[PDB]
Amino acid sequence: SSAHPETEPKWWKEATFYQIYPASFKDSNDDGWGDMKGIASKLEYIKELGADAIWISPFYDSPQDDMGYDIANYEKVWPTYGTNEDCFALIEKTHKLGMKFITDLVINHCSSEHEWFKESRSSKTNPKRDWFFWRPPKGYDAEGKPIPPNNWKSYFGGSAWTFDEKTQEFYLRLFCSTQPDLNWENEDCRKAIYESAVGYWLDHGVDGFRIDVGSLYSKVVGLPDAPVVDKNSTWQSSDPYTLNGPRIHEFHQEMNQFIRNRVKDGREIMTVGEMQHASDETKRLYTSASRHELSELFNFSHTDVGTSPLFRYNLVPFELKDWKIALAELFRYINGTDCWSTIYLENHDQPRSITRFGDDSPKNRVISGKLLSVLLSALTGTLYVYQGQELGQINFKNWPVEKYEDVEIRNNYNAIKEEHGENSEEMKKFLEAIALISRDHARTPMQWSREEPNAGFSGPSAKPWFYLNDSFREGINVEDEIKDPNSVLNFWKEALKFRKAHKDITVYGYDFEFIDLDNKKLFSFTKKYNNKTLFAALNFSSDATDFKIPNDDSSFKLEFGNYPKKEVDASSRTLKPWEGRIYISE
Numbered sequence: 159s160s161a162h163p164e165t166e167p168k169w170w171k172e173a174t175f176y177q178i179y180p181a182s183f184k185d186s187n188d189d190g191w192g193d194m195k196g197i198a199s200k201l202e203y204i205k206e207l208g209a210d211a212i213w214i215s216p217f218y219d220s221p222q223d224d225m226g227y228d229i230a231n232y233e234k235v236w237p238t239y240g241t242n243e244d245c246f247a248l249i250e251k252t253h254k255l256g257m258k259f260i261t262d263l264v265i266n267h268c269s270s271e272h273e274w275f276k277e278s279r280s281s282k283t284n285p286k287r288d289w290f291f292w293r294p295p296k297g298y299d300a301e302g303k304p305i306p307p308n309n310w311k312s313y314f315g316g317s318a319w320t321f322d323e324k325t326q327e328f329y330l331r332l333f334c335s336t337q338p339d340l341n342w343e344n345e346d347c348r349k350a351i352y353e354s355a356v357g358y359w360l361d362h363g364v365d366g367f368r369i370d371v372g373s374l375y376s377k378v379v380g381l382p383d384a385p386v387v388d389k390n391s392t393w394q395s396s397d398p399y400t401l402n403g404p405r406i407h408e409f410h411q412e413m414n415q416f417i418r419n420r421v422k423d424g425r426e427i428m429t430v431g432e433m434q435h436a437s438d439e440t441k442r443l444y445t446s447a448s449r450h451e452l453s454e455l456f457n458f459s460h461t462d463v464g465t466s467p468l469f470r471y472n473l474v475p476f477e478l479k480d481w482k483i484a485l486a487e488l489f490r491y492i493n494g495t496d497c498w499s500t501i502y503l504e505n506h507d508q509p510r511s512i513t514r515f516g517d518d519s520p521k522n523r524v525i526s527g528k529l530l531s532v533l534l535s536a537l538t539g540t541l542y543v544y545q546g547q548e549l550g551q552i553n554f555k556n557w558p559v560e561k562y563e564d565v566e567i568r569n570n571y572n573a574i575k576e577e578h579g580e581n582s583e584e585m586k587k588f589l590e591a592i593a594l595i596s597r598d599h600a601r602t603p604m605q606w607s608r609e610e611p612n613a614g615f616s617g618p619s620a621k622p623w624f625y626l627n628d629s630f631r632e633g634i635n636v637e638d639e640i641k642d643p644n645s646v647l648n649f650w651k652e653a654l655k656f657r658k659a660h661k662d663i664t665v666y667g668y669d670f671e672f673i674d675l676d677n678k679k680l681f682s683f684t685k686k687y688n689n690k691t692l693f694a695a696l697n698f699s700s701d702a703t704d705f706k707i708p709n710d711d712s713s714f715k716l717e718f719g720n721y722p723k724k725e726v727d728a729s730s731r732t733l734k735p736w737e738g739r740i741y742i743s744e
């Protein structure tokens with residue numbers, strides 16, 4: 159383990175994080191929106207699950223055009239969630255329970271309702287004009303409409319620019335129309351960002367930050383037209399010119415130094431960057447401890463499987479090997495380095511992992527939910543669990559498009575309507591995809607009980623901000639699962655206990671090697687920690703599946719699995735349907 163600097167323990171390496179989506183976690187006042195008092199009331203539940211830390215998605219003052227990722231004031235809690243004092247009390251309560259607290263740092267862009275943007279947009283001459291990207295129209299089209307400065311596509315569909323009537327220029331917004339991108343080329347802007355979004359929260363005791371699209375701050379000069387890679391789209395991915403840009407490491411080093419110099423009590427701050435996509439070299443540049451940038455990052459390859467690289471909402475076939483390799487991208491690069499990794503399958507931007515990677519049928523949803531827990535329990539990195547994942551939540555079914563709340567759905571729908579027609583093959587493919595892939599599968603209210611109609615998220619007379627998934631009626635809820643010894647929830651409790659008990663090799667294990675990589679059913683691997691060897695055999699299928707342990711001998715003992723403990727034959731070399739096993743040799 160001495161030739162593996164990544165094994166150096168840190169609180170944030172071995173902490174299990176639980177991610178809370180504040181709108182959808184717990185309503186305490188029957189207005190249909192989750193809130194901070196709701197979260198506070200459920201911290202004991204989170205601790206009992208086995209979490210060491212929480213990450214709360216944005217709770218700052220926001221018009222909610224992108225459900226909190228459009229921030230109008232970094233230093234004020236959205237009144238619907240509570241007051242600043244409510245938040246400070248929540249941070250303190252979290253700490254007094256022995257858990258860490260990280261907040262969502264969203265500084266690629268802010269809301270157009272932020273005072274910075276209200277000033278910037280007011281004239282061409284004000285001190286904050288170049289805190290954002292303002293450009294004249296490229297020209298005007300045959301119908302007299304202004305043409306945007308370039309061909310860049312928004313992450314939510316259509317053009318990445320919005321025209322301002324008053325000042326007669328476009329502003330850049332990679333996300334929705336009211337999320338203008340901040341201009342990190344402006345040093346005054348960077349300093350103000352650090353003071354407001356970072357310093358304020360350090361002063362109020364956060365243990366770290368999850369950094370929203372942290373790889374987008376550096377734009378290539380000139381904002382040039384992007385390559386025409388999609389021949390059936392007016393607008394093109396800006397990635398070559400916005401993703402991991404030439405100043406991105408400079409900016410992250412600067413922000414890291416700001417944090418180091420602003421902390422007052424010498425505490426260890428974690429940063430996890432939502433970096434999206436990166437070569438292994440880029441990942442190392444971000445997460446090597448010696449680089450003083452990020453602690454770790456999220457990489458999207460494993461959550462991208464089964465979607466077109468050109469458009470997330472066009473489905474494509476994939477096989478198990480694709481997912482194995484994409485998952486391994488999270489962690490293999492850290493082997494023998496001072497880097498660190500993340501491990502997760504769910505977040506507020508993803509559909510449910512059982513639906514995607516298990517089998518959500520009534521027959522298989524429990525056992526395959528447990529299989530995913532076995533897998534995650536054994537992988538190296540900081541583990542994240544998303545609200546409802548521990549219940550074995552599944553995608554919702556048979557919703558019409560108009561029921562989806564997400565701006566990502568609304569904007570993409572409208573772009574397709576405009577470009578291809580509402581009644582088109584392009585629309586049909588989109589509608590097929592949203593049923594599997596939409597972020598909204600993560601955002602339906604948390605299911606605390608079987609109570610009609612709101613599943614204990616709110617009182618029975620309240621109207622939730624977004625519709626409940628019908629799965630609460632099928633026993634997918636906290637109250638029913640606590641009482642069922644065979645539940646996914648009770649299994650996740652066991653999985654986290656197992657992971658912690660064997661943390662040297664589960665959290666800090668190294669020399670990861672795939673066994674039978676090509677296998678369409680068997681996901682198998684070994685890891686090392688000094689004299690210890692961990693071996694996993696995981697059957698991602700409804701069929702029985704054979705496996706072999708490399709260098710098999712009597713030392714390999716069955717330490718965890720999802721089939722009944724007293725009914726498993728550890729010496730058998732065939733897995734039952736959806737069976738997973740973790741063996742450890744000393």
Ligand SMILES: [Ca+2]
Pocket residue numbers: 184185186187188189190191192193238
């Ligand atoms: Ca509420």
